C-alpha cells in the first residue's frame with residue numbers, strides 16, 4: 001500500500017516528523033511505518049525547472065546566470081524543502097546551489113495539517129488524538145529549516161571553529177549566490193559515510209573516533225552543535241583523508257545550564273552512579289521524578305550503556321553494545337505527550353550523543369572512549 005505517494009506531496013513535514021520521532025527502524029514503532037518513511041526519504045520527487053528558476057529570479061535578480069560558466073538542470077540531490085544543483089562559476093570554481101521550492105515557509109501550516117490527516121486516517125497517532133505539543137514543535141522546526149540566511153550564518157560560524165583543523169572542514173559559503181531561499185557552497189570531494197561500510201576497519205575506526213571527539217567538543221567546549229547527526233552528512237575523501245561537514249540547518253546554540261547539567265549526567269554514568277544520573281535528569285527536566293518505574297529504569301539503562309564506553313579502558317564494540325535496540329530508550333517517545341513536556345534542548349542533547357553513538361554502531365567501529373571523555377571533562381572544569 002502506497003501511502004508513500006501522499007507523504008511525498010509533504011516531504012518536508014514528513015521527514016522532519018521522522019527525525020523528531022525516530023522512524024529509524026527502532027525496536028517498538030511499527031516496522032510498516034518506518035518502511036514507508038524510508039521510502040519517502042529516498043524518493044526524488046522532482047519539480048520542473050520553471051519552479052526552481054522562479055526562486056532564482058526572485059532572489060538573485062535577472063543578472064544571476066552571468067556569474068556562471070554552467071548550470072546543471074537536473075538536480076544531483078534532493079533536499080528536504082528543495083533541490084541541489086551543480087554549477088560552475090565564471091573562473092572554474094565548482095559549487096552546489098541548494099534551492100528551495102517556491103513558497104515553502106508559507107505552506108508549513110497546510111502541509112503539517114495534511115500530514116497529521118494522512119497519519120490520523122491510517123490510525124498511527126496512537127495516543128488517539130492530534131498531539132498538540134508535537135504539531136507546535138514540528139511547525140517551529142520547519143520555519144527554522146526554511147531560513148537559509150540563518151543556515152549561512154551557522155555554516156560561516158562552524159567554519160571558524162574548525163579553521164585549520166587537520167581532519168574536518170566546512171565548505172565555504174558563496175555570498176553572492178546566497179539569499180533567503182538559496183544556499184550556495186563550494187562543492188566537496190569524497191563520498192557520504194552511507195557508502196563507506198566497504199572501507200577498512202582502521203579507517204572506519206579513525207573516522208568514528210574523530211566524530212565522537214568532535215561531538216564531545218560540540219557539547220562541552222563550543223557554543224554551537226549539529227543536532228540530529230547523520231552519516232549521510234559526513235563526506236569522507238580517501239585522497240586527502242578528510243571529512244567534510246554538510247547541513248548547518250541542524251545547528252543550535254543552547255543555554256549553558258542544560259549542558260552544565262548534561263556533563264554531570266554523563267560523568268555520573270561514566271562512574272556507574274544511577275542515582276546521580278536520575279537526579280540530574282530530573283533537575284534538567286527530562287524526567288519529572290514520577291514516571292512509572294519500568295520506563296524510568298529503561299531510560300536509565302540506556303544512559304549507562306553510554307557510561308560503559310566512557311568508563312572502560314578496553315575498546316568498546318559500538319556495533320553490538322550500542323545498536324538502536326540497545327539505546328533507543330535514551331528518548332522514550334512517550335514523554336512529549338505529558339502536561340509539561342521536556343524542554344527541546346534536552347531532546348537534542350540526548351539525540352546528539354545517541355546519534356553519534358549510532359554512526360559508530362552503523363560503521364562497526366571499535367575504539368576506547370575513556371580518555372576522550374576524561375579529557376573533555378577535565379577541560380570543561382578548567383574553564384571554571
Ligand SMILES: Nc1ncnc2c1ncn2[C@@H]1O[C@H](COP(=O)(O)OP(=O)(O)NP(=O)(O)O)[C@@H](O)[C@H]1O
Pocket residue numbers: 077078079080081084096098171185186187188189232233246247248249
Ligand atoms: N557542497 C556540497 N558538495 C557536495 N554535495 C552537496 C553539497 N551541499 C549539498 N550536497 C548534497 O545535497 C544533499 C542535501 O543537502 P543538505 O544541505 O543536506 O539538504 P537538507 O534538506 O538539510 N537534507 P539532510 O541533510 O538530509 O537533512 C547532501 O546530503 C549532499 O548529498
